[PDB]
Design an enzyme around this catalytic site. Structure first.
Site, PDB file in Angstrom:
ATOM      1  N   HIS A 135       0.805  -1.251   0.000  1.00 35.92           N
ATOM      2  CA  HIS A 135       0.000   0.000   0.000  1.00 35.92           C
ATOM      3  C   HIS A 135       0.832   1.293   0.000  1.00 35.92           C
ATOM      4  O   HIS A 135       0.338   2.351   0.399  1.00 35.92           O
ATOM      5  CB  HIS A 135      -0.986   0.049   1.183  1.00 35.92           C
ATOM      6  CG  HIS A 135      -1.638  -1.260   1.495  1.00 35.92           C
ATOM      7  ND1 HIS A 135      -1.115  -2.147   2.412  1.00 35.92           N
ATOM      8  CD2 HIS A 135      -2.779  -1.823   1.032  1.00 35.92           C
ATOM      9  CE1 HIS A 135      -1.893  -3.212   2.478  1.00 35.92           C
ATOM     10  NE2 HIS A 135      -2.913  -3.038   1.656  1.00 35.92           N
TER      11      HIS A 135
HETATM   12  S1  FES Z   1       1.794  -0.425   3.416  1.00 34.04           S
HETATM   13 FE1  FES Z   1      -0.033  -1.649   3.862  1.00 34.04          FE
HETATM   14  S2  FES Z   1       1.265  -3.453   4.156  1.00 34.04           S
HETATM   15 FE2  FES Z   1       3.085  -2.199   3.830  1.00 34.04          FE
END
Ligand code: FES
Ligand SMILES: CCCCCCCC/C=C\CCCCCCCC(=O)OC[C@H](COP(=O)(O)OCCN)OC(=O)CCCCCCC/C=C\CCCCCCCC
Ligand code: HEC
Ligand code: HEM
Ligand code: HEM
Ligand SMILES: CC1=C(c2ccc(Oc3ccccc3)cc2)C(=O)C2CCCCC2=N1
Lengths: 240, 80, 68, 59, 109, 372, 48
Positions: free
Chosen positions: E74
């Site tokens: 993410h």
């Molecule tokens: S940013 Fe959501 S898992 Fe690494």
């Protein structure tokens, strides 16, 4: 950081009862052997698997014999080379993954046995990756060891364009154009990942036919039995 | 709990017919398709609208996900 | 003799279509934007992908007709 | 007049003894018939693409 | 990257200019407030457990915005000292327990 | 004769109700799924090996080289899904028709669900692909969120400091056996059901109109078995990789996480409820309570009518709860970005609100409308 | 295994360190030798 999903190329083997194109597999193997074999592993296929699919036993044995592979230990207690056989699995290009990343700019060329089943889209993705190489647009400044392909997730693939017009020549006398090569090898990499593919769809036909036969026959027995209750008529008759 | 010890039933008469004497599919398309439709009209109002609402939230959410994935006009525009 | 790939014919045939040339318009319009700005952190990948998606949809419709 | 289906019932499957002999023999034949048919249908569906069609080629 | 306890162990020798770059980064700006010194035992050699703190996701080094790494899952961006800069991740990368045997050998755990 | 009498009172002349719809067929199908998973599974284990060196090679050895090994694998792999489809039908039926009023039968049920969830989760690890490894690494690590002993509990479960060869080999042992515990539990699930009799769609005592299981429901369950087989073999023969993830054909690698990390489809609703809450422990407790709230359903029941057949408000909220679960299943499949975070958040609250707050109130209103 | 049976940890480590054994692959994609350790099993006299 954007997606480009592949299109729907209508393959020979697309439909529910549509089998693999074994001549296209035949050529597709030659594309692996000649082009993809030098860089890419295919660990879960042997030359006997080719027998009765794209080649004969004698033809497949000759191709195994062409390459030489290790065997041993001998009586002296050491290894030696011998010409390949039907039972030998396809020669791995390097001894390990670290030798691959050493040989190819810190990038591991993945195993092509399951690559169709391993990636989203499958042959459509592999075909669009091979044929879809193009120039990086304004802004996209890639670094050393990298090439621009849009269908690849990161847009910066670590693979040099592997196939181009007449990189090889087909034994049956087929025009070896870039997209013809991509078509044939993708038709082969389907088979590598799913060798059951033809047999499975025949079972599919036979299953649909047999289910088509039985479901009404069983439903008829159910209706025949339940008829007694479904037609019955309840009369209440209390006394005064 | 057995046939004979279930409950007290009185003054009922059940007329039945042998499955060989009677038909298996009596008035199937004739009486059935209307009955099927009637049953569909009964349930539809209770059953469907949540799945419609799912479809609306589904397509919208995917639409809005694709909008947010893509470029935006404030990304360094009117700013050299 | 030199050889030719049906790919390059069918791609140029598909590049004719309205949505292809309209994406191509925005791509060119982006190219000059990124070129004309002094220094930016921006690219014209999106519009190339819009173009290619519109094109290769059409390519797939009739490329395999030429191949065997 | 003895009918079509009654003639089967009367002599072939009234007894449960012969019922099974009919099923077994019928299934024995059905297997040969169906497989052969559905094979040929699949092979006509997929004409020229299987090994058996291009086997004479390289042999 | 090393397979240590099954987890990726990211040992990182940082260039002399890159070491005091992370020292030059200001301390109250970070989500999890930490100076580079309170994370490292030898300025040149920083070591980290390569596991994103948002959810278990292996980062890639020499990537993202800053000089450290990036998380594909993410988009959590880290700096060369392992400290969290861009979201949605909560904390700085987990520094292990370690000490240096000689000038050439290092021991972790 | 002592056995035949058990089979008589079980399956031959058990008095069933006369008016039982096709929603009661799923019980027998769940057994057929359990037996199918057992028989296919046994034949897979005949060739499968639980070492990290060989685990992948062995599964591919089955597909490629073991004669008809592929068809056995995908019958196991898709049958696992068909088991779960059947479960979610079998659970929902009871929610709708008020069958949870057979408390013990239902509560044994709730156990049966959880054991299958554990079975299928551990089963998914076995082939040792990326999504199998990384699924375990993600899902197991959740327990470390526990207050004081979770971090220890996880390392004990794994047999080390991560998912590894220690974990894989025991996960095989647990997979091969827990199905038999499930079958044992399932016979007690049936044992309490004969005590209580079977329910019908009206929710009205059908002692006045019973019929013998055989020949009626025998031939009906046979018909339904073919539809389950059809649904299986459609998946096996035409779409074996449909429900499955591609990344599990990439051999497992602990130094490289795949980007879109998730469980299988049958946990995605629960995965979405976990992601809804930002706090780790809260996420685990919500994840747990999402399943375990089933045990509170018979206590939350209010209506003087047993079945939802004669209950509009409850029917609409029930069909809302189904749609809301299908929303959560969708959201769990998608990555944790806008707008899916807010949709997942609302869907998750709506889930517990339908069960705990609304559907009881609906039943209470429904009573007041009928002068109860 | 010798530690706490017949030798101490330090003594047993020294004996492991005496002998040299293979390890790898490295970044170049090849094997190399290194001094032994507590976790190393006893060197086999021949390769087969
Ligand atoms: S940013 Fe959501 S898992 Fe690494
Ligand atoms: C999503 C998949 C759901 C597809 C099934 C939709 C069925 C549509 C339907 O028939 O709904 C109306 C119909 C009307 O039946 P009665 O009230 O008994 O009256 C009979 C009048 N002749 O309702 C039913 O069939 C109720 C059956 C409920 C079971 C459905 C379960 C779906 C899954 C949910 C997951 C479970 C929760 C945890
Ligand atoms: C080296 C001399 C190569 C030849 C010849 C071929 N490939 Fe390759 N490939 C190579 C590398 C170094 C990589 C890794 C690229 C990266 O940046 O990750 C690859 C990758 C592929 C992939 C995977 C793409 C993906 O989604 O990860 C495929 C599907 C692939 N290669 C296919 C392929 C085919 C079909 C080839 C010949 C017919 C072929 N490659 C040749 C290096 C080399
Ligand atoms: C409720 C019963 C069962 C369920 C739900 C179940 C589920 C699963 C699942 C989901 C997989 C992974 C499939 C894949 O994608 O490859 C799997 C694999 C496996 N299961 Fe089961 N299983 C069950 C019973 C059994 C039993 C009883 C055995 C042995 C007696 C067995 C042996 C295996 C083996 C060997 C594998 C690994 C091979 C493979 O991946 O296909 N299973 N199981
Ligand atoms: C392995 C899984 C399961 C098996 C094999 C199983 C088996 C059965 C069978 C055979 C029946 C009788 C047939 C029917 O009425 O449908 C039944 C009924 C029932 N089961 Fe299950 N079951 C399973 C899972 C569950 C679960 C998960 C629940 C609840 C959480 C549950 C609760 C019930 C209830 C309440 C009934 C009564 C049905 C009625 O209203 O008549 N079961 N089960
Ligand atoms: C006991 C029982 C079974 C039943 C039958 C066979 C079972 O065992 C089997 C398990 C696996 C395969 C086949 C049968 C389990 C439950 C039903 O279907 C039903 C269906 C509706 C009437 C009530 C009922 N009662």
């Amino acid at each position: 950081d954007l997606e480009l999903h592949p299109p729907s190329y209508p393959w020979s083997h697309r439909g529910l009862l549509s089998s693999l194109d074994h001549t296209s597999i035949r050529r597709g193997f030659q594309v692996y052997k000649q082009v993809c074999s030098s860089c890419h592993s295919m660990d879960y296929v042997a030359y006997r698997h080719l027998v009765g699919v794209c080649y004969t036993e004698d033809e497949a044995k000759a191709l195994a014999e062409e390459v030489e592979v290790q065997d041993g230990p001998n009586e002296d207690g050491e290894m030696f080379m011998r010409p390949g056989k039907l039972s030998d699995y396809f020669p791995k290009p390097y001894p390990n993954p670290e030798a691959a990343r050493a040989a190819n700019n810190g990038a591991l060329p993945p195993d092509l046995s399951y690559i169709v089943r391993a990636r989203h889209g499958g042959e459509d993705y592999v075909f669009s990756l091979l044929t879809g190489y193009c120039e990086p647009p304004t802004g996209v400044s890639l670094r050393e060891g990298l090439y621009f392909n849009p269908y690849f997730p990161g847009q910066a693939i670590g693979m040099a364009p592997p196939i181009y017009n007449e990189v090889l020549e087909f034994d049956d006398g087929t025009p070896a154009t870039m997209s013809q090569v991509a078509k044939d090898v993708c038709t082969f990499l389907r088979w590598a990942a799913e060798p059951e593919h033809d047999h499975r769809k025949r079972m599919g036909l036979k299953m649909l036919l047999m289910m088509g036969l039985l479901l009404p026959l069983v439903y008829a027995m159910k209706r025949h039995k339940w008829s007694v209750l479904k037609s019955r008529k309840l009369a209440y008759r209390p006394p005064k | 709990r057995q046939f004979g010890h279930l409950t007290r039933v009185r003054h009922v008469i059940t007329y039945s017919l042998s499955p060989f004497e009677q038909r298996a599919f009596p008035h199937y398309f004739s009486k059935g398709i209307p009955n099927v439709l009637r049953r569909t009209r009964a349930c539809i109002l209770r059953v469907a609208p949540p799945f419609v609402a799912f479809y609306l939230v589904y397509t919208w959410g995917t639409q809005e996900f694709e909008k947010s994935k893509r470029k935006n006009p404030a990304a360094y525009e009117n700013d050299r | 003799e030199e050889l030719v790939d049906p790919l390059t014919t069918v791609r140029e045939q598909c590049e004719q279509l309205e949505k292809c040339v309209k994406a191509r318009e925005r791509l060119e319009l982006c190219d000059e934007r990124v070129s004309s700005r002094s220094q930016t952190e921006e690219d014209c990948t999106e519009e190339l992908l819009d173009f290619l998606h519109a094109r290769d949809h059409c390519v797939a419709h009739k490329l395999f007709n030429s191949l065997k | 007049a003895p009918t079509l289906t009654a003639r089967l019932y009367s002599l072939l499957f009234r007894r449960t003894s012969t019922f099974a002999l009919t099923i077994v023999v019928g299934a024995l034949f059905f297997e040969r018939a169906f497989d052969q048919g559905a094979d040929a249908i699949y092979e006509h569906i997929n004409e020229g693409k299987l090994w058996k069609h291009i086997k004479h080629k390289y042999e | 990257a090393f397979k240590w306890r099954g987890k990726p162990l990211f040992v990182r020798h940082r260039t002399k200019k890159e070491i005091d770059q992370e020292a030059a980064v200001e301390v109250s700006q970070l989500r999890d407030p930490q100076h580079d010194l309170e994370r490292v035992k030898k300025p040149e050699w920083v070591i980290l457990i390569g596991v994103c703190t948002h959810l278990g996701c292996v980062p890639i080094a020499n990537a993202g915005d800053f000089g450290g790494y990036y998380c594909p899952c993410h988009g959590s961006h880290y700096d060369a000292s392992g400290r969290i800069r861009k979201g949605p991740a909560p904390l700085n990368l987990e520094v292990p327990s370690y000490e240096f045997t000689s000038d050439d050998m290092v021991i972790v755990g | 004769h002592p056995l035949m009498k058990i089979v008589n009172n079980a399956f031959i002349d058990l008095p069933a109700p006369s008016n039982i719809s096709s929603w009661w067929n799923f019980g027998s199908l769940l057994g057929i799924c359990l037996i199918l998973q057992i028989l296919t599974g046994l034949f897979l284990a005949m060739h499968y090996t639980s070492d990290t060196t060989t685990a992948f090679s062995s599964v591919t050895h089955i597909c490629r080289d073991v004669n008809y090994g592929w068809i056995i694998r995908y019958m196991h792999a898709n049958g696992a899904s068909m088991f779960f489809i059947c479960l979610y039908m079998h659970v929902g039926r009871g929610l709708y028709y008020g069958s949870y009023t057979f408390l013990e039968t239902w509560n044994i049920g709730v156990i049966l669900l959880l054991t299958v969830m554990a079975t299928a989760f551990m089963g998914y690890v076995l082939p040792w692909g990326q999504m199998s490894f990384w699924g375990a690494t993600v899902i197991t690590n959740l327990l470390s969120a526990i207050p004081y002993i979770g971090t220890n509990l996880v390392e004990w479960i794994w047999g080390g400091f991560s998912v590894d060869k220690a974990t894989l080999t025991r996960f095989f042992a647990f997979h091969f056996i827990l199905p038999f515990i499930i079958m044992a539990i399932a016979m007690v699930h049936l044992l309490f059901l004969h005590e209580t009799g079977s329910n019908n769609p009206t929710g009205i005592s059908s002692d006045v109109d019973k019929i013998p299981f055989h020949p009626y429901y025998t031939i009906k369950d046979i018909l339904g078995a073919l539809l389950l087989i059809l649904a299986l073999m459609l998946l096996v023969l035409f779409a074996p990789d449909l429900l499955g993830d591609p990344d599990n054909y990439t051999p497992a690698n602990p130094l490289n996480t795949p980007p879109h990390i998730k469980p299988e489809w049958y946990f995605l609703f629960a995965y979405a409820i976990l992601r809804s809450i930002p706090n780790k422990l809260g996420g685990v407790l919500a994840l747990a309570f999402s399943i375990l709230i089933l045990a509170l359903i018979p206590l939350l029941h209010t209506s003087k009518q047993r079945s939802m057949m004669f209950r509009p408000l409850s029917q609409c909220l029930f069909w809302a709860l189904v749609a809301d679960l299908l929303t959560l299943t969708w959201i769990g499949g998608q990555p944790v970005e806008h707008p899916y975070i807010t949709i997942g958040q609302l869907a998750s609250v709506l889930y517990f609100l339908l069960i705990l707050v609304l559907m009881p109130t609906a039943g209470t209103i429904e009573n007041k409308l009928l002068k109860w």
